[PDB]
UniProtKB/Swiss-Prot annotation, chain A:
GO terms for biological process: pantothenate biosynthetic process; spermine catabolic process. Involved in the production of beta-alanine, a precursor of pantothenic acid. Multicopy suppressor of fenpropimorph resistance. Keywords: FAD, Flavoprotein, Oxidoreductase. It catalyses: spermine + O2 + H2O = 3-aminopropanal + spermidine + H2O2; spermidine + O2 + H2O = 3-aminopropanal + putrescine + H2O2; N(1)-acetylspermine + O2 + H2O = 3-acetamidopropanal + spermidine + H2O2; N(1)-acetylspermidine + O2 + H2O = 3-acetamidopropanal + putrescine + H2O2. GO terms for cellular component: cytoplasm. The keyword Flavoprotein applies. Present with 6960 molecules/cell in log phase SD medium. Its EC number is 1.5.3.17. Pfam families: Amino_oxidase. The gene is FMS1. Belongs to the flavin monoamine oxidase family. This is Polyamine oxidase FMS1. Its cofactor is FAD. The lineage of its organism: Eukaryota, Fungi, Dikarya, Ascomycota, Saccharomycotina. It is an enzyme of class 1 (oxidoreductase).
Curated annotation (Swiss-Prot), chain B:
Involved in the production of beta-alanine, a precursor of pantothenic acid. Multicopy suppressor of fenpropimorph resistance. This is Polyamine oxidase FMS1. Binds 1 FAD per subunit. Its cofactor is FAD. Belongs to the flavin monoamine oxidase family. Present with 6960 molecules/cell in log phase SD medium. Pfam families: Amino_oxidase. GO terms for molecular function: N(1)-acetylpolyamine oxidase (3-acetamidopropanal-forming) activity; N8-acetylspermidine:oxygen oxidoreductase (propane-1,3-diamine-forming) activity; oxidoreductase activity; polyamine oxidase activity; spermine oxidase activity. Keywords: FAD, Flavoprotein, Oxidoreductase. GO terms for biological process: pantothenate biosynthetic process; spermine catabolic process.
């Protein structure tokens, strides 16, 4: 009944649809399981009408990111503000010591940079001579360079460099050392409404093409020259080509038995071996977010980027100074509970400086992410959990301890104290249609496989699009966006050319 | 009649010194190290100043400490005996503009951040696209401003280009003389300020027979006798017969060999003449002029926040307007051509506040060409020097919580007592600082021609004869170890 059937209304599938239309193609559909378009791009509304991207927030690699370049051309034409370059000098806060950034004695940013080159030198030209966890790599570095590292550098450096966890959404012991570092193609641009980006692409094709709330439960390839798709509601479709953009985590459900899980699509014939084997190259990290909405700004807007360090011990230094080798240090690190806000690094975007909004956007990683999203409706507990980091931040920013004002109890005796009015938490690890944030590597993985296998398609008719199906922009909004145009282009020609 | 020697080394710089050390270490005997100066070390030279304070007027740091084999060897020592040989002095750079004052780590300018985007822009410009022409570093910066003007503020367009020029002090060349393709390069980790490079020189120089060292003998010619002997002639008339020879004179001095005129201090006459691959390589690589001026003060009475300070050359809002209105690169150059004397604010200057790294109340300042040539050409007129650097010397103190400097070369205010200056450009046996690229240059040609030698018996060593460590003290060092090892094996087979 259709020429092309796109599964998923995230940016990949939306672009793909936008392309097909652009190329005069017709009779296509966009089946989306959620009751909204956007996928991992969602802008929610909070206190006093403030808006926040609960999913993607930035345009990365602005020197070459094509979606960003496109958005920039639009802004040059209409002068409408679509983004703001918010990169800043990071402030680093340790619970006991306070600020440790740009320290005349610690000079942590300089050793972190050395640490970075150490990493590149370890994996460059050796062909993956063993892949460890980012944690293990940092341990090698510390051991190898302790003769040129002070005591405080050995103590704090490993904690500061963990900000990298917030880039993969993975704790440093679950994250591949080889994929930890990546090239940043220029500054980052905070999207002032990724929902604006989603809206544009969504309104660029036949509105009657979109079918919200259609959960696709099975895709069958009948050699007859067509693909049959069945929505969970009973409707069936026959398409020449099908573009699947469900996230990798959802797709990984196919290789498992018991096709009852939400989102899971039964393939017939089953996904070919190169594909199924690719799912052994790890995947899915869990970057999470917590938005803290205050009444008004009453702290120093020195910087828009703040990272709180996990607690560290002088005793750890001693162990590094006494370890004879790696194996001895590996086991010597046997210090024998309870996870608090100081158990992992946290990344706070002070939105007051960059957007003038009295709020903080907080990013978190696995394993913490799922635990916080699990209590997302318990505002009071969430407050108790982050209260100590929040207060430490306010202290360092020439302000006072936070007052809980999430419940209607107006008082003017607190005009010089930050007042929390609301907390918003993401829900990506618990949403069945995302089951996580985006592609990520566990030690021992190699993403190339999935990208090549996904890009090569199930076959000439069953194709794949999404952040996990491409090299440039892997895991990013523009990668997914570009993967959509890719499959669309391939199909666009194969059709129009015939007739 | 001429005294027989197994190997003759020309130049007692770190390359020749290391070459000899490796020969002795390999059991070779009857060797000579001929040096024109009255000292060893060459571009590694430690001088003494006000009250006995010592400074490296040539090489100061151990670069790429994660791989630098020389540095590693120096660290091993210090680990055994626990003695201080070096100090990691990298720090957060303090950046100073004449008016604005400090512009580093600024919440509005964010210069270091756009500076980072710039280098990434350079990487993407060449490292990923063959065929692209070279242009000067200056032209690359303008090309960057033009492409990213939509995403830069006025103060950034104005101050960024002056800040990124700290790179001039890595090459010893003004950004209009510098090859853009060669501007950026990766640093293999932190740097280490040698606390006496002359300690490195002496250690290596005393690891081989002393009688081997012949100071003050300037070599004037080298000849291959079609058979297996090399004739070397000192200027003092002495003559030597040798199986092999490792030439370590600077690239700038070896270039005098392809010119017609035998009476030039340092010039060596070759017979047969240097092969065409060597001669033609000089057209594809050049020499920079990094210079030094060390300001010695009575006592420290300034802030020791950082040990790294860079003074930016003046900029103008007129410049931002031209960048904003330029249609393309062609027009930008046109408008830029909108035309007095040279001042301490005409180019970026890099000062090392030694007070924080070593505790000595003195500033080590680096400068580039063409300024280096001018400043060394008047290095004797101390009064004129003070006058020249007084403006910047004062702005630094103003920014480091202090007052104007007081000339005391002849209670809480900084008093200048001495001004020492380098002399590498005018010195006949150095003629510049080290190898560097002008736009269009390709260092590979030279490194290739040098590492393959004039022939089987006539070899070359030195900072200009190797890829890893090119221009650095450890590169020369390694090149010396290279030529001596190959020779040892060949002699070994006898
Ligand atoms: C917390 C967080 C922060 C992030 N921040 C950034 C950032 O700053 N910058 C950046 O570039 N990227 C960021 N990302 C990643 C970025 O959001 C994603 O790469 C991108 O949105 C993925 O798009 P997609 O179209 O491939 O998939 P979506 O993930 O867009 O997937 C497409 C659609 O598939 C649908 N679907 C699933 N199963 C079925 C089914 N069975 N039937 C029908 N439809 C189905 C889903 O409902 C979904 O709408 C972030 C991600 C997270 C989780
Ligand atoms: C101002 C300045 C700062 C520097 N800073 C650093 C730094 O921080 N870190 C770093 O790694 N490098 C630095 N360098 C570079 C470093 O000093 C050189 O790479 C290295 O010392 C060159 O050593 P060489 O043995 O190759 O040559 P020299 O240049 O060492 O040459 C060897 C010898 O040849 C002798 N000679 C010349 N002609 C004749 C002749 N006709 N007969 C006999 N002998 C002759 C010379 O007198 C000289 O002593 C700096 C250089 C300069 C000029
Ligand atoms: N501090 C940055 C927070 C947002 C990070 C988004 C990263 C997207 C790209 C991931 C690249 C690696 C994918 N395996
Ligand atoms: N910081 C003073 C200079 C330190 C040594 C720099 C060596 C390389 C200079 C450029 C020429 C060699 C690489 N092309």
């Amino acid at each position: 009944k259709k020429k092309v059937i796109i599964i998923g209304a995230g940016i990949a599938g939306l672009k793909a649809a936008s392309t097909l239309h652009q190329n005069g193609i017709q009779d296509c559909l966009v089946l989306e399981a959620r009751d909204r378009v956007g996928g991992r791009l969602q802008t929610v509304t909070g206190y006093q009408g403030r808006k926040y991207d609960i999913g993607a927030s930035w345009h990365h690699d602005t020197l070459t990111n094509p979606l960003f370049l496109e958005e920039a051309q639009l802004s040059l034409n209409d002068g409408r503000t679509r983004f703001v370059f918010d990169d800043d000098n990071f402030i680093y806060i340790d619970e006991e010591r306070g600020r440790v950034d740009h320290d005349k004695e610690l000079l942590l940013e300089i050793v972190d940079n050395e640490m970075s080159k150490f990493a590149e030198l370890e994996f460059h030209q050796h062909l993956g001579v063993s892949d460890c966890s980012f944690f293990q790599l940092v341990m090698k570095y510390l051991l190898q360079r302790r003769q040129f590292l002070t005591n405080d550098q050995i103590r704090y450096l490993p904690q500061l460099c963990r900000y990298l966890e917030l880039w993969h959404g993975l704790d440093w012991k679950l994250l591949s050392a080889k994929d930890t570092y990546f090239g940043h193609q220029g500054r980052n641009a905070f999207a002032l409404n990724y929902d604006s980006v989603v809206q544009r692409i969504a309104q660029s094709f036949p509105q009657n093409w979109l079918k919200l709330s259609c959960e696709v439960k099975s895709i069958t390839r009948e050699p007859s020259k067509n693909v049959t798709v069945n929505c969970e509601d009973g409707t069936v479709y026959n398409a020449d080509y099908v573009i699947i953009t469900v996230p990798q985590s959802v797709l990984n459900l196919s290789v498992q038995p018991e096709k009852n899980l939400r989102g899971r699509i039964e393939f017939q014939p089953p996904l070919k071996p190169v594909i199924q084997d690719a799912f052994d190259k790890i995947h899915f990290g869990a970057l999470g977010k917590v938005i803290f909405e205050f009444e008004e700004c009453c702290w120093s807007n020195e910087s828009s980027k703040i990272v709180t360090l996990a607690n560290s011990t002088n005793e750890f230094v001693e162990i590094v100074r006494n370890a004879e080798n790696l194996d001895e240090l590996d086991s010597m690190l046997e210090r024998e509970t309870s996870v608090t806000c100081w158990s992992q690094p946290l990344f706070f975007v002070n939105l007051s400086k960059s957007t003038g909004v009295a709020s903080f956007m907080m990013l978190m990683q696995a394993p913490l992410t799922n635990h916080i999203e699990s209590i997302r409706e318990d505002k009071e507990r969430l407050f108790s959990f982050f209260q100590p980091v929040l207060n430490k931040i306010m202290k360092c920013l020439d302000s006072e301890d936070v007052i809980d004002g999430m419940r209607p109890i107006e008082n003017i005796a607190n005009a010089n104290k930050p007042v929390l009015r609301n907390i918003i938490v993401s829900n990506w690890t618990r949403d069945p249609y995302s089951r996580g944030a985006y592609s990520a590597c566990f030690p021992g993985d190699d993403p190339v496989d999935m990208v090549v296998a996904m890009s090569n398609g199930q076959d000439s008719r069953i194709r794949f699009a999404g952040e996990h199906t491409i090299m440039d922009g892997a895991g990013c909004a523009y990668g997914a966006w570009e993967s959509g145009r890719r499959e669309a282009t391939r199909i666009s020609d194969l059709l129009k050319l015939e007739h």
